[PDB]
Amino acid sequence: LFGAIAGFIENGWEGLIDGWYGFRHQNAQGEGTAADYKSTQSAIDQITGKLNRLIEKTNQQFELIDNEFNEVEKQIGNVINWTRDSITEVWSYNAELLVAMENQHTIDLADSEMDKLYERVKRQLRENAEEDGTGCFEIFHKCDDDCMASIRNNTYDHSKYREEAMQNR
Amino acid sequence: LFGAIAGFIENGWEGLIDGWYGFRHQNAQGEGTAADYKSTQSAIDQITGKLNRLIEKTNQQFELIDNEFNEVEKQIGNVINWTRDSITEVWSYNAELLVAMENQHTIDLADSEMDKLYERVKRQLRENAEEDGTGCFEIFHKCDDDCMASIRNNTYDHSKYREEAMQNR
Amino acid sequence: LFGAIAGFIENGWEGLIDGWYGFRHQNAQGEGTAADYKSTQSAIDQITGKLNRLIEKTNQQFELIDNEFNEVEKQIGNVINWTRDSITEVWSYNAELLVAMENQHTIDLADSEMDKLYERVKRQLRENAEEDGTGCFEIFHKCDDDCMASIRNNTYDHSKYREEAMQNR
Amino acid sequence: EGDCYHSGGTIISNLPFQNIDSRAVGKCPRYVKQRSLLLATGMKNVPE
Amino acid sequence: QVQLVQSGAEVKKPGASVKVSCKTSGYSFSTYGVSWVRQAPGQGPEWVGWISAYTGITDYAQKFQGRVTLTTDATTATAFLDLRSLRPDDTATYFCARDKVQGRVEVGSGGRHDYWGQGTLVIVSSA
Amino acid sequence: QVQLVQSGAEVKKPGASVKVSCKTSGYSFSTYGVSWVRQAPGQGPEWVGWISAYTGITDYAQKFQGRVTLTTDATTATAFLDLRSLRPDDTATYFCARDKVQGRVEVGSGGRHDYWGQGTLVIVSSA
Amino acid sequence: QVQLVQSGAEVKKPGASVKVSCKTSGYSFSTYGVSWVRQAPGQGPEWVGWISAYTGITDYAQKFQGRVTLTTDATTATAFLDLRSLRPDDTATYFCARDKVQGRVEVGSGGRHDYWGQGTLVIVSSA
Amino acid sequence: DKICLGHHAVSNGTKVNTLTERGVEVVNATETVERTNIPRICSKGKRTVDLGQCGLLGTITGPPQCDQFLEFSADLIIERREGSDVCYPGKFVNEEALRQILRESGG
Amino acid sequence: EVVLTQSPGTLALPPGERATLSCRASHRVGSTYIAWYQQKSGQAPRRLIYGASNRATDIPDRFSGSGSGTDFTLTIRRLEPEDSAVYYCQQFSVSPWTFGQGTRVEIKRT
Amino acid sequence: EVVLTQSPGTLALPPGERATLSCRASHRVGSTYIAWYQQKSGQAPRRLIYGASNRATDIPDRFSGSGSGTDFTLTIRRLEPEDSAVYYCQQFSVSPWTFGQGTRVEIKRT
Amino acid sequence: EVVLTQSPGTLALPPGERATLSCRASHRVGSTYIAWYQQKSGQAPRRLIYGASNRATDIPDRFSGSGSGTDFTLTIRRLEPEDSAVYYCQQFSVSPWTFGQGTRVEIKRT
Ligand SMILES: *[C@@H]1O[C@H](CO)[C@@H](O)[C@H](O)[C@H]1NC(C)=O
Ligand SMILES: *[C@@H]1O[C@H](CO)[C@@H](O)[C@H](O)[C@H]1NC(C)=O
Ligand SMILES: *[C@@H]1O[C@H](CO)[C@@H](O)[C@H](O)[C@H]1NC(C)=O
Ligand SMILES: *[C@@H]1O[C@H](CO)[C@@H](O)[C@H](O)[C@H]1NC(C)=O
């Protein structure tokens, strides 16, 4: 894997239909859940990049070289069949390896994006919060809805809550 | 690489024949070393997954198209030889690239698993310990054998040793 | 990606012509910038490893099998053309996938090396500094030029500045 | 309209691979042995 | 029915600041975002910039970097194009076009400049 | 000599809880782990669940998730199968089989359901 | 003009410590680093060790691990080879060679043992 | 007061294969292998000649079935199984070479 | 899940003749994750083949498995009296590990 | 950046004949990131083709695009009077998203 | 480690004839990590070939190296008097960087 999407974060949120990643906060005003648009779009861009690169066709034209109606001579027929089968094997190998390799990277990059957003919030809170261990951040200055929103759009000033938080350890 | 198996962890333990990853603790009761079964098995599963996918053969049957005893005509012979050599080149390329790519991922995923277990323990201790820098955790509440075992099977309650540890910084 | 070269570190230093990675410190003695030789060379080694593996040619000799001057017979000609085109497609596919895959890994491993050096310094400072969030470390014991140099060549003793730093939080 | 034909009809597809006829001619997806190969277009699903 | 309706034509003095609007109807907003193309009289089309209504991320061409600012609906699903320090060269027809799927993975270029606005002439002169 | 010896046959009332054992000899324990298969009278075999004796990780089929619990030796290298809320459908022959290499990387399926137990009939009825 | 000039020949008693120098001119220092090869009289060449003048990283052969130490210029762009516990087997001609591009990515082996020193005979005997 | 983060999920995912595992469940996946065929010869934008009962070689010699094809033109030439190069019984030397020429002739 | 469907339901052949048993999967399974079993009335199923073509220990060489993808075959080259039983194919690539419904083999001559 | 150069500058053909318009890129662009547009004097450009060969909604099937790599083609199979306009190709693979200088199509007969 | 074994031990050929020197590795080495050297009695070894086939600066074009995998060849197309020396092949793909035992080249005619 990477840094655990299916690790310390135990499960995903089926209720999160607003994006691919997001925050779920809890305070004195109730329950809150909002998606993160930029990190979601980062993931979406990369996968879209893959798909559009993979979904593609040749502009190379191949013709008929044997005959379904009146069979060609055996010796040239067997060479042709032997060659075609060989190309089939190569493309069968390429195809299955391609898809397998891409799927490994797709899953891992999604892991990557989740880890990147997570450790970003961690640096965003400085010493005002502590790592829960399940992807959560226990805040030590009772953050209100406006405070939470400042964390979401990366504007949270750590040094304006620092005194209160470090006191409460 | 990833996050350093052959980095901040300077070397491996040849004495660790119980698993692929593990803990080595030191306290007032003596020396201790035990393997981690789950993270080891995670690595073993992934590698086994690769090997069983890679070790495989065709169910495609290829026949004879030239002759070792009485040589075929030169022109069809040269086409056949030219084609076969070409397929050989493709499979030689595929093979060496496959193995090289797989080996890169095998090493890196083993790195990944070690990093995942490491930073898991880090979150498991909260503020009761500090990062040594060589993969160790200096504990500030003199952990006994039962305390160590609670860290090994992910049950260690950080808040039951928190007071003593934060006092000792 | 990985752990952000083009993430929390907002941009690179065009003035850094001494290496690929490095430090830029600020204290009471002025402005300072120096490269890190070992982590740079790690990256350079890996890329050089790729290139020398990729830049290569066959020792397989291929001959002429058709004729530019007096054309071969149509049926064998069409088989030959069909086969050659097929190999072209395979090598065209292999080539573009190879380069694309390598470029993805090159960028990511450079990311890896930057993250490895960064989090190494983080463990090197222990509790004497705090994470800025832009790749910087705010030091709490006013580090002089000799102190900075000790951080650069991995000799900085954290416990000789610990008291002063933890006091200043 | 399509640019990929076989004796049984026409392969109209953007997909890179076809499992219909190895003797398809024109401008076609590559014939493969597999009946199906699913390319992931999302993250790892971890339901509650 | 998806339609892009832009503001009326405009006349500005050189060195001033213009603001063209683009009202959105039909689709949902923040599912695509907008590309802007401008066309000088008797000349071809040239791309100006793109903004996501989903993320807010903007991408400009080098020519306009620093004097163009793209924004999106206060809440009414409408995109704006703000140009300033208007040269006489900036005299052109400014088109907005709905462009590129956002909060979703989709193959192909079906949502790429698929619907355009009627246009907006911007005459930059002193007379 | 590897052999799997299960407990004796059992008769339970509906809604009760049964417990079949599987004693291990021959190999080492925690080097494989155990698969459990059950067979209704006159019917074919159906997989129930698997447990690692090395990690303790269990994997059940959806049908039994929530009322089946697999465990392993207190220290005597023996595996247990605990079923509860026994329906009359749970009337079957319960086989344990040694399954899947653990603390080691190995190619192939040589250690997959390679040795079975003699079986254990579980009759769930009230009469 | 790149040239490697080594120190003069030397005679040492068994169990002693020798020190051969290698002065660098022509190129820049810390752009390559140095390989050391030694040649016993009437015998072929054998690689001893390599040191980067850019990073300082050294790589020795197993035979010399623990009694060989390679270092580089105090600031004057010169490399040193320090051998100790000199056996009579250590009697050989010690060559230094400029080797392997450093602070830069480059394809090929053009900078691999491209320029050598004239040599330095080290006679280890008691007589 | 805490803030958590996580990712979206669905109750019903799609299984795919990876390098290292099999049947891992992802949020959503797409097919890369085309099985859907149109049982017809799509000919829009191409001058199509269905030779029917005319053998492609017949367009050279001109037996009765090929009278309408003696000077044909096509981007797409289609041979049918009922086709016949011959009226008076006989055959062509190097017939497959000639068919391939006429196939890529345009008419 | 992966559905293993076997054919035929019942196969009746004289002793010393060649029996061919099919197991067809709904999804492409790797050859390594497929096993064949024999079961007689009352006893535990003994493993015949593992990995689609590898014979298990002490299994007679008249039991040979083959095939790949979605089509797998257990061949009894020359039937013996004690081969009269039920034969199940199994998949354990992805969980749930599923079994085929089975094929019964019967012999002949009164 | 990527330069799209179209040819010819001007194409004059009688109604019902076949028009072929070229767009040649400086760099290899993936077929998906290429579009063709029609524009008449005064109005907004309507999108004809997207992805190099896909027809846009309600676009007549006499507009067909083809090609790959650096050479792309818009074909008007049979010209109609209302096809008299200017035609631009566009690339949006890498920014800046660039346009071709255009090709004018004119008809015939007095 | 990687063993480079050269053949023959000694090669004696008249001046102006073609000399072929073999170096056979125990393990597959990439062509880039192979060099050939010339050494005369008393002096330092001068590098002839690097990367298995690239001539070093100011080296005559009668020294050409070829080969790949485990078999590498240094060819002296037309021997000159001053070509009488000892020739060593070297590998520096993986450490320890090893040398071949050498091949001596001698000339002819009294
Ligand atoms: C080649 O394979 C085709 C099926 O793809 C078959 O009809 C034909 O008979 C084979 N060739 C020969 C010479 O049998
Ligand atoms: C083709 O190669 C084989 C060896 O693989 C050789 O024996 C044969 O002579 C070659 N063909 C011709 C026409 O020489
Ligand atoms: C095969 O392709 C070449 C160009 O690569 C062409 O000159 C030749 O005519 C083609 N073969 C036939 C039989 O037309
Ligand atoms: C799954 O991905 C495909 C991409 O090919 C998309 O078209 C489809 O809408 C997606 N399904 C869901 C339920 O989002």
How many structural domains is chain K composed of? 1
Rounded to an integer, what distance in angstroms lies between the CA atom of residue G104 and that of residue C45? 9
- Return the ligand number nearest the Cα of D24: 1
Tokens in use for I59? 């299994």
Expressed in angstroms and rounded, the spacing between residue A81 Cα and the centre of ligand 1 is 6
**B33 within ligand 2 shell (Cβ under 6 A):** no
Rounded to an integer, what distance in angstroms lies between the CA atom of residue C128 and that of residue C167? 10
Expressed in angstroms and rounded, the spacing between residue D25 Cα and the centre of ligand 3 is 17
- For residue A76, which residues of chain B lie inside 8 Å, CB to CB? 76
Q: CA dist H92 to A71, E89, H67, H88, Å? A: 14, 72, 19, 12
Supply angle C-alpha C158, C159, C162, rounded to 5.
Answer: 90
Tokens in use for H53? 């009962």
Beta-carbon count within 10 A of K8 CB: 12
- The sign of the torsion formed by the CA atoms of I54, I59, I62, I63 equals negative
Contact H11, A14 (CB under 8 A): yes
Contact F98, F34 (CB under 8 A): yes
Adjacency order of strands within the sheet including D4-6: D9-10, D4-6, D25-26
The upper half-sphere exposure of residue F86, i.e. CA atoms within 13 Å in the direction of its Cβ, equals 21
- For residue J64, which residues of chain H lie inside 8 Å, CB to CB? 45
Q: Which residue has the tokens 């490095």?
A: C22
Chain K: closest CA distance from residue C60 (Å): 10
Contact K91, K98 (CB under 8 A): yes
Contact F115, F13 (CB under 8 A): no
CA torsion, ordered B5, B8, B14, B17, to nearest 10 deg: -60
| Resolution of the solved structure (Å) | 2.8
Rounded to an integer, what distance in angstroms lies between the CA atom of residue A22 and that of residue A7? 17
The alpha carbon of G38 is separated from its chain's Cα centroid by a whole number of angstroms, namely: 8
DSSP state of I2: P
For residue K70, count CB atoms less than 10 angstroms from its CB and return exposed for 0-12, middle for 13-18, buried for 19 or more.
Answer: middle
* H-helix or E-strand spanning residue H61: helix H58-61
Nearest by Cα to D38 from B110, C126, H13: H13
The upper half-sphere exposure of residue B44, i.e. CA atoms within 13 Å in the direction of its Cβ, equals 21
For residue J14, count CB atoms less than 10 angstroms from its CB and return exposed for 0-12, middle for 13-18, buried for 19 or more.
Answer: exposed
Question: In chain H, what's the furthest Cα-to-Cα distance?
Answer: 97
Partnered with residue I23 across adjacent β-strands are I6, I72
**For chain B, how many residues are written?**
169
DSSP state of B71: P
Name every residue in H having a CB less than 8 A away from some CB of J.
44-45
Rounded to an integer, what distance in angstroms lies between the CA atom of residue I24 and that of residue I33? 14
Domain with I110, as residue range(s), is 1-110
Chain A: closest CA distance from residue B62 (Å): 7
Contact G81, G48 (CB under 8 A): yes
Rounded to an integer, what distance in angstroms lies between the CA atom of residue J83 and that of residue J103? 12
Phi-psi region of K60 (alpha: psi -120 to 50; beta: other; left: phi over 0): beta
Tokens in use for E19? 């603001």
Contact F8, F94 (CB under 8 A): no
- Return the ligand number nearest the Cα of B77: 2
Beta-carbon count within 10 A of A83 CB: 23
- Determine if the peptide bond prior to J60 is cis (ω within 30°): no
Q: CA Rg, chain I, in Å?
A: 13
Long-range contacts of B87-96, Cβ-Cβ distance < 8 Å, separation of 24 or more: B87/A86, B87/A90, B88/C60, B89/C58, B89/C60, B90/A90, B90/C87, B90/C90, B90/C91, B90/C94, B91/A90, B93/C94, B94/A90, B94/A93, B94/A94, B94/C94
Specify the amino acid at residue I2. V
Contact A141, H59 (CB under 8 A): no
Contact A6, D44 (CB under 8 A): yes
Q: After which residues is chain B broken (C to N over 2.5 A)?
A: none
CA torsion, ordered D32, D33, D35, D41, to nearest 10 deg: -50
Pairing of strands F17-25, F78-84: antiparallel
Chain I: closest CA distance from residue F120 (Å): 10
**For chain J, how many residues are written?**
110
Long-range contacts of G49-52, Cβ-Cβ distance < 8 Å, separation of 24 or more: G49/G81, G50/G99, G50/G100, G50/K95, G50/K97, G51/G79, G52/C41, G52/G100, G52/G102
Rounded to an integer, what distance in angstroms lies between the CA atom of residue B29 and that of residue I100? 56
Supply angle C-alpha F6, F12, F17, rounded to 5.
Answer: 75
**Chain E contact for A106 (CB, 8 A cutoff):** no
The alpha carbon of B75 is separated from its chain's Cα centroid by a whole number of angstroms, namely: 52
| Residues A59, J67: C-beta atoms closer than 8 Å | yes
Q: CA dist E105 to A41, C101, E102, F64, H1, Å? A: 9, 21, 8, 36, 35
Rounded to an integer, what distance in angstroms lies between the CA atom of residue A102 and that of residue A106? 6
Contact B121, B137 (CB under 8 A): yes
Tokens in use for G10? 């030397």
- For residue A132, which residues of chain H lie inside 8 Å, CB to CB? 2, 4
- For residue I73, which residues of chain B lie inside 8 Å, CB to CB? none
Specify the amino acid at residue G62. Q
Q: SS3 sequence, chain E?
A: CCEEEECCCEEECCCCEEEEEEEEECCCCCCCCEEEEEECCCCCEEEEEEECCCCCCEEECCCCCCCEEEEECCCCCEEEEEEECCCHHHCEEEEEEECCCCCCCCCCCCCCCCEEECCCEEEECCC
Chain A: closest CA distance from residue D2 (Å): 12
Expressed in angstroms and rounded, the spacing between residue A64 Cα and the centre of ligand 3 is 14
- Determine if the peptide bond prior to G41 is cis (ω within 30°): no
Rounded to an integer, what distance in angstroms lies between the CA atom of residue F107 and that of residue B47? 10
Chain J: closest CA distance from residue H44 (Å): 9
- For residue K68, which residues of chain C lie inside 8 Å, CB to CB? 59
Residue nearest to atom 1 of ligand 2 (CA): B81
Rounded to an integer, what distance in angstroms lies between the CA atom of residue A144 and that of residue I45? 64
In terms of CA atoms, which chain I residue is nearest residue B58? I68
Q: Which residue has the tokens 């029609």?
A: J38
Which residues are CB-contacts of C127 (< 8 A; sequence separation ≥ 6)? Answer: B130, B169, C158, C162, C165, C166
CB pairs under 8 A between A and E: 29
Across the interface, of F45, F112, F117, the residue whose CB is closest to I92 is F112
Q: Which residue has the tokens 């964390």?
A: A151
Q: What is the DSSP string of C98-125?
A: HHHHHHHHHHHHHHHHHHHHHHHHHHHH
Q: How far apart are the first and last CA of chain D?
A: 47
Rounded to an integer, what distance in angstroms lies between the CA atom of residue A122 and that of residue C122? 14
**CB interface of B with H, residues 97-156, below 8 Å:** 102, 105, 109
| Residues D42, E108: C-beta atoms closer than 8 Å | no
Tokens in use for G46? 């054998």
Q: Which residues of H7-21 are buried (b: 16+ CB within 10 A; e: fewer)?
A: bbbbeebbbbbbbbb
Rounded to an integer, what distance in angstroms lies between the CA atom of residue I110 and that of residue A40? 74
* H-helix or E-strand spanning residue F92: strand F92-98
Pairing of strands B129-131, B137-139: antiparallel
- Return the ligand number nearest the Cα of H11: 4
**Chain E contact for A48 (CB, 8 A cutoff):** yes
Partnered with residue G120 across adjacent β-strands are none
Across the interface, of A38, A52, A55, the residue whose CB is closest to E55 is A38
The upper half-sphere exposure of residue H18, i.e. CA atoms within 13 Å in the direction of its Cβ, equals 25
Experimentally determined by: X-ray
Q: What is the DSSP string of H10-54?
A: -SS-EEE--SS-SSEEES-EEE-EE---BSS---TTS-EEE-TTS
DSSP state of A25: E
Q: Is B112 helix (H, G, I), strand (E, B) or coil?
A: helix
Number of the ligand 3 atom closest to the C-alpha atom of H104: 14
Q: CA dist B38 to A141, B4, B20, E48, Å? A: 37, 20, 10, 55
- Residue of E102, E106, E107, E109 best suited for mutating to test ligand 4, as the one with most atoms within 8 Å of CB: E106
Contact A126, A149 (CB under 8 A): no
The upper half-sphere exposure of residue A12, i.e. CA atoms within 13 Å in the direction of its Cβ, equals 30
Q: After which residues is chain F broken (C to N over 2.5 A)?
A: none
Q: Is B82 helix (H, G, I), strand (E, B) or coil?
A: helix
| Domain spans, chain F | 1-127
Which residues are CB-contacts of K70 (< 8 A; sequence separation ≥ 6)? Answer: K24, K25, K26, K27, K28, K29
Which residues are CB-contacts of A29 (< 8 A; sequence separation ≥ 6)? Answer: A144, A145
| Domain spans, chain B | 1-169
Nearest by Cα to A103 from H29, B46, B54: H29
Nearest by Cα to A33 from A48, A55, A60, A14: A14
- The sign of the torsion formed by the CA atoms of H79, H80, H81, H86 equals negative
Rounded to an integer, what distance in angstroms lies between the CA atom of residue I25 and that of residue I68? 10
Q: What is the DSSP string of A42-72?
A: HHHHHHHHHHHHHS------B---S-SSSPP
- Determine if the peptide bond prior to K8 is cis (ω within 30°): yes
Q: Which residues of B51-65 are buried (b: 16+ CB within 10 A; e: fewer)?
A: bbbeeeeeeeeeeeb
Rounded to an integer, what distance in angstroms lies between the CA atom of residue G18 and that of residue G122? 8
- Return the ligand number nearest the Cα of C68: 3
For residue H40, count CB atoms less than 10 angstroms from its CB and return exposed for 0-12, middle for 13-18, buried for 19 or more.
Answer: exposed
Rounded to an integer, what distance in angstroms lies between the CA atom of residue A52 and that of residue E112? 14
* H-helix or E-strand spanning residue B167: helix B162-167
Expressed in angstroms and rounded, the spacing between residue C72 Cα and the centre of ligand 1 is 25
Contact B114, B9 (CB under 8 A): yes
Tokens in use for C46? 């890996």
Nearest by Cα to E83 from E48, E116, E118: E48
**C74 within ligand 3 shell (Cβ under 6 A):** yes
The upper half-sphere exposure of residue G52, i.e. CA atoms within 13 Å in the direction of its Cβ, equals 18
Q: CA Rg, chain B, in Å?
A: 27
CATH placement of domain C1-169: 3.90.20.10
Q: How far apart are the first and last CA of chain B?
A: 34
Q: How far apart are the first and last CA of chain K?
A: 44
The alpha carbon of K107 is separated from its chain's Cα centroid by a whole number of angstroms, namely: 17
Q: How far apart are the first and last CA of chain A?
A: 34
Rounded to an integer, what distance in angstroms lies between the CA atom of residue J52 and that of residue J68? 8
Beta-carbon count within 10 A of G77 CB: 17
Rounded to an integer, what distance in angstroms lies between the CA atom of residue A149 and that of residue C22? 35
Contact J49, J76 (CB under 8 A): no
**Chain J contact for E95 (CB, 8 A cutoff):** yes
CATH placement of domain F1-127: 2.60.40.10
Adjacency order of strands within the sheet including D30-31: D30-31, D17-18, H33-34
Contact G78, G5 (CB under 8 A): no
| Residues C8, A120: C-beta atoms closer than 8 Å | yes
Sequence-ordered strand ranges (E) for chain A: 21-26, 31-36, 129-131, 136-139
Expressed in angstroms and rounded, the spacing between residue C77 Cα and the centre of ligand 3 is 7
Tokens in use for E126? 């002193």
Rounded to an integer, what distance in angstroms lies between the CA atom of residue A128 and that of residue H1? 12
Specify the amino acid at residue C54. L
Tokens in use for A45? 């861009």
What is the CATH number for J33?
2.60.40.10
**CB interface of J with H, residues 33-92, below 8 Å:** 61, 64, 77
